[PDB]
Design an enzyme around this catalytic site. Structure first.
Site, mmCIF file in Angstrom:
data_model
loop_
_atom_site.group_PDB
_atom_site.id
_atom_site.type_symbol
_atom_site.label_atom_id
_atom_site.label_comp_id
_atom_site.label_asym_id
_atom_site.label_seq_id
_atom_site.Cartn_x
_atom_site.Cartn_y
_atom_site.Cartn_z
ATOM 1 N N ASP A 54 -4.394 -5.298 -64.145
ATOM 2 C CA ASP A 54 -3.493 -4.547 -63.285
ATOM 3 C C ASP A 54 -3.809 -3.042 -63.219
ATOM 4 O OD1 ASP A 54 -1.297 -3.725 -61.714
ATOM 5 O OD2 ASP A 54 0.237 -4.323 -63.199
ATOM 6 N N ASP A 97 -4.581 -1.084 -56.142
ATOM 7 C CA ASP A 97 -3.778 -1.865 -57.070
ATOM 8 C C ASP A 97 -4.182 -3.311 -57.150
ATOM 9 O OD1 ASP A 97 -1.743 -2.930 -58.657
ATOM 10 O OD2 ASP A 97 -0.093 -2.260 -57.366
#
Ligand SMILES: CC#Cc1cncc(-c2cccc([C@@]3(c4cc(C)c(=O)n(CC)c4)N=C(N)c4c(F)cccc43)c2)c1
Length: 375
Positions: free
Chosen positions: A36, A219
């Site tokens: 992440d 992201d």
């Protein structure tokens, strides 16, 4: 722990996340961990949950150290709560090292864990500025760089239906052509600047600050390309116009409804290419990354709908700025060059293409009549 040994170290998909095998504690406890780039905590399930196959058992770890500090993280879509501690962490198919890192042991959560995702925790790779409870909690990558000789860089090669995370360097076998860099605007999220957007070569003609209202980020922990309202509405109107030979329900455009075609008949040609122009390392120079419909029409694997190929529209509205999620990263080799405060993009070995079009990273482009696109 060479780069060739790190290739194919990721599993998963854009919809549920890409994950890497890691170990926590002594003796090591193996867990699958979501990669992440949009968060900064190393947060792992540490209590049973209906969606967890396994979890971190601190009591079984002789190296665990309790920080005597709780962490409570509500967010728009859900929440996690836990206890802060430190322990020994290793990436078996990553660098040949063991580091002591902060670990947020998740004791309670709501809509955080995903059914059948196959991961038990999250490796937050962004900067300390956005770590929870605050920026004093050192993120994992920072600890790794401090404690080892590992160069301050990692790269992600996400592959559509696993991929690779190379820490410490660039693996040339994972890309073709040139590597184009965009500056990291601020070290919090991996914040970048979009200077121009085209849909099938047609410019959206907005003031470039609109593309970055209130920030633009890279992201790997977000599925979709997420766009600010004004940009999102113009993109949809432009895609609908390009694809007008077929009409889809409003729910498809809202990302709540699937669109299905008989297996192998997806009309890729009716859908336009999206070009996102990113700020270059030189004033008023940029490069573009091109997104094919194979990237923004996300396939939804379902045995029950399998006489068909069904898709979700993977572009959605955002009220927190642009999010270049996994559907954007797929087919690109993305270099998170923290040492040089820049993000590199190149065409991946697993890139998207058909016999007519191919995903691309192209430049340079010049814009003399430019303001700062940063919001
Ligand atoms: C590709 C992909 C993916 C993917 C698919 N399903 C769930 C997740 C997911 C699950 C839980 C939490 C998060 C998520 C996330 C992760 C951690 C550790 C955290 O503390 N927060 C809140 C600050 C959010 N990471 C993000 N980048 C993100 C986001 F932009 C928006 C909402 C939630 C998240 C993400 C990721």
């Amino acid at each position: 722990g060479s780069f060739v040994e790190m290739v194919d170290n990721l599993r998963g998909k854009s919809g549920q996340g890409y994950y890497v095998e890691m170990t926590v504690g002594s003796p090591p406890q193996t867990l699958n961990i979501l990669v992440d780039t949009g968060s900064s905590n190393f947060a792992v399930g540490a209590a049973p949950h209906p969606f967890l196959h396994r979890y971190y058992q601190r009591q079984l770890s002789s190296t665990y150290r309790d920080l005597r500090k709780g962490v409570y993280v509500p967010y728009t879509q859900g929440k996690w709560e836990g206890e802060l501690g430190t322990d020994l962490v290793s990436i078996p198919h990553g660098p040949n090292v063991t580091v002591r890192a902060n670990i947020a042991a998740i004791t309670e959560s709501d809509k955080f864990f995903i059914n059948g995702s196959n991961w038990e925790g999250i490796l937050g790779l962004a900067y300390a500025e956005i770590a929870r409870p605050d920026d004093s909690l050192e993120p994992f990558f920072d600890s790794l760089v401090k404690q080892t000789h590992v160069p301050n860089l990692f790269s992600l090669q996400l592959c559509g239906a696993g991929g690779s995370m190379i820490i410490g360097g660039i693996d040339h076998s994972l890309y073709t052509g040139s590597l184009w860099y965009t500056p990291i605007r601020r070290e919090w999220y991996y914040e970048v600047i979009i200077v121009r957007v085209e849909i099938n070569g047609q410019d959206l003609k907005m003031d470039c600050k609109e593309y970055n209202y209130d920030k633009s980020i890279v992201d790997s922990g977000t599925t979709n390309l997420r766009l600010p309202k004004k940009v999102f509405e113009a993109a949809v109107k432009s895609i609908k116009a390009a694809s007008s030979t077929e009409k889809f329900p409003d729910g498809f455009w809202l990302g709540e409804q699937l669109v299905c075609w008989q297996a192998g008949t997806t009309p890729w040609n009716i859908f336009p290419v999206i070009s996102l122009y990113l700020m270059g390392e030189v004033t008023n120079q940029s490069f573009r990354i091109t997104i094919l419909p194979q990237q923004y029409l996300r396939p939804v694997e379902d045995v029950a709908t399998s006489q068909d190929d069904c898709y979700k529209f993977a572009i959605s509205q955002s009220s927190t700025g642009t999010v270049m999620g996994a559907v954007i990263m797929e087919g690109f080799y993305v270099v998170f060059d923290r040492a040089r405060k820049r993000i590199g993009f190149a065409v991946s070995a697993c890139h998207v293409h058909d016999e007519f079009r191919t995903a691309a990273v192209e430049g340079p482009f010049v814009t003399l009549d430019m303001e700062d696109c940063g919001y």
